[PDB]
Design an enzyme around this catalytic site. Structure first.
Site, PDB file in Angstrom:
ATOM      1  N   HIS A  69      51.155  44.827  41.775  1.00 40.62           N
ATOM      2  CA  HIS A  69      50.974  46.298  41.912  1.00 40.62           C
ATOM      3  C   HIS A  69      49.671  46.642  42.658  1.00 40.62           C
ATOM      4  CE1 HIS A  69      48.192  46.493  38.503  1.00 40.62           C
ATOM      5  NE2 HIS A  69      47.872  47.678  39.001  1.00 40.62           N
ATOM      6  N   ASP A  70      48.747  45.688  42.847  1.00 45.02           N
ATOM      7  CA  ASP A  70      47.479  45.939  43.586  1.00 45.02           C
ATOM      8  C   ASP A  70      47.231  44.868  44.660  1.00 45.02           C
ATOM      9  OD1 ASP A  70      46.285  48.383  42.623  1.00 45.02           O
ATOM     10  OD2 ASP A  70      45.577  47.346  40.826  1.00 45.02           O
TER      11      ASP A  70
ATOM     12  N   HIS B  21      39.668  45.475  40.946  1.00 42.28           N
ATOM     13  CA  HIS B  21      41.072  45.312  41.417  1.00 42.28           C
ATOM     14  C   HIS B  21      41.298  43.895  41.928  1.00 42.28           C
ATOM     15  CE1 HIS B  21      40.762  49.741  41.508  1.00 42.28           C
ATOM     16  NE2 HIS B  21      41.967  49.610  40.942  1.00 42.28           N
TER      17      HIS B  21
ATOM     18  N   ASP C 119      48.099  50.610  33.815  1.00 38.53           N
ATOM     19  CA  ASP C 119      47.075  50.716  34.879  1.00 38.53           C
ATOM     20  C   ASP C 119      45.851  51.508  34.372  1.00 38.53           C
ATOM     21  OD1 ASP C 119      46.451  49.758  37.397  1.00 38.53           O
ATOM     22  OD2 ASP C 119      46.871  51.672  38.383  1.00 38.53           O
TER      23      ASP C 119
ATOM     24  N   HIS D 172      42.633  41.993  36.674  1.00 41.75           N
ATOM     25  CA  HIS D 172      43.189  43.345  36.414  1.00 41.75           C
ATOM     26  C   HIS D 172      44.718  43.268  36.330  1.00 41.75           C
ATOM     27  CE1 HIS D 172      44.276  47.572  36.750  1.00 41.75           C
ATOM     28  NE2 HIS D 172      44.820  47.330  37.967  1.00 41.75           N
TER      29      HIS D 172
END
Ligand SMILES: [Mg+2]
Ligand SMILES: [Zn+2]
Length: 333
Positions: free
Chosen positions: A124-125, A84, A237, A88
């Site tokens: 998103h992470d 992550h 994802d 990614h």
């Protein structure tokens, strides 16, 4: 948020990515990373080219410079963890581009929604530490306690949304500064709904909601658009098994090392370690990939393609080919 310097922008702009097609479903981010001693700059340059190539930022009053500031602000909030990390989220951005433009999912969405999805991939992470929501709740970690107390167990996803809002609050990094009224609200709400939907605890219900909306000719249009966005970020994802086998394998090694470091910390804190996070069970990659394919990825990709996503058929084809290849690793062991 310290403003991005000209020197930081220049380091990205010099990367020419010679011989890479960032729009191609066989694009190899591992080969792109190996290709220089500045892999973080190459990764940023890939995100930059994908967003400019879409022609979307231009249309919503996002300058080249604000786009690049935003990418570098996202980059500095990713950590040196095995999976992550910034690679990614650049992978998910590239993968979403292919779903939109090679899989023709762009036809289901407005241009603003396509722009929001490509931007959302990169936030998103944010600030992932290589530990899942379960770790925070089981260890009664401060973030875990805050989540329980406030009634949202999506520990990481809420944290990601918080740092996304923080980057976008500065005009120099606000890719949405060109928007106002309902458009600016839709951009933020749709970004946040998409990030919240990446919690795998909500996988089944997010999938079922999208399928029921897609089967319903009288579905609310706004709701169908929103669920399509959520399903596409979810698809990006869990896209690792839709990639050429050797790209797929490198992703699976990176996620396994991240799970093992979590298991190491869980042992250290005397909390429950699931077998998959246990470095001493040394369970086989092949069986793990087939299990994820059979129970999660194949049904997800097949159902969304069959529902309406017909252009993304190649994802189902590659999962089938990857499963057959893992079966051959087992057959020859
Ligand atoms: Mg996540
Ligand atoms: Zn992710």
């Amino acid at each position: 948020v310290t403003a991005i310097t000209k020197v930081e922008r220049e380091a990205v702009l010099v990367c020419e990515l010679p011989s890479f097609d960032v729009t191609d479903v066989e694009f190899d981010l591992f080969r792109a990373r190996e290709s220089t001693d500045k892999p973080l700059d190459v990764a940023a340059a890939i995100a930059y080219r994908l967003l400019l190539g879409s022609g979307l930022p231009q249309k919503f009053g996002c300058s080249d410079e604000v786009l690049l500031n935003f990418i570098l602000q996202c980059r500095k909030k990713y950590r040196n963890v095995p999976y992550h990390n910034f690679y990614h989220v650049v992978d998910v951005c590239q993968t979403i581009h292919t779903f939109l433009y090679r899989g023709n999912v762009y036809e289901k969405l407005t241009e603003l929604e396509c722009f929001v999805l490509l931007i959302t991939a990169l936030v998103h992470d944010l600030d992932h530490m290589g530990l899942n929501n379960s770790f925070y709740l089981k260890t009664e970690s401060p973030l875990g306690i805050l989540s329980s107390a406030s009634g949202n167990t999506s520990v990481l996803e809420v944290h990601h949304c918080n740092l996304a809002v923080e980057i976008l609050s500065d005009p120099e990094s606000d890719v949405f500064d060109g928007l106002e009224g309902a458009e600016r609200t839709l951009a933020f709400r749709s970004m946040i709904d998409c990030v919240l939907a990446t919690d795998m605890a909500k996988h089944g219900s997010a999938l079922e909601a999208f399928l029921a909306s897609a089967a319903d000719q009288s579905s609310d249009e706004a709701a169908f658009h929103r669920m399509t966005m959520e399903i596409i970020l979810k698809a990006g994802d869990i896209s690792n098994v839709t990639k050429p086998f050797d790209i797929s394998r490198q992703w699976a090694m990176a996620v396994t090392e991240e799970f093992y470091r979590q298991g190491d910390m869980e042992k250290e804190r005397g909390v429950e370690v699931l077998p998959m996070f246990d470095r001493s069970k040394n369970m086989e990659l092949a069986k793990g990939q087939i299990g994820f394919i059979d129970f999660v990825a194949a049904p997800f990709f097949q159902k969304i393609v069959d529902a309406c996503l017909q252009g993304m058929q190649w994802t189902v084809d590659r999962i089938k080919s990857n499963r057959a290849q893992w079966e051959r690793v087992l057959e020859t062991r």
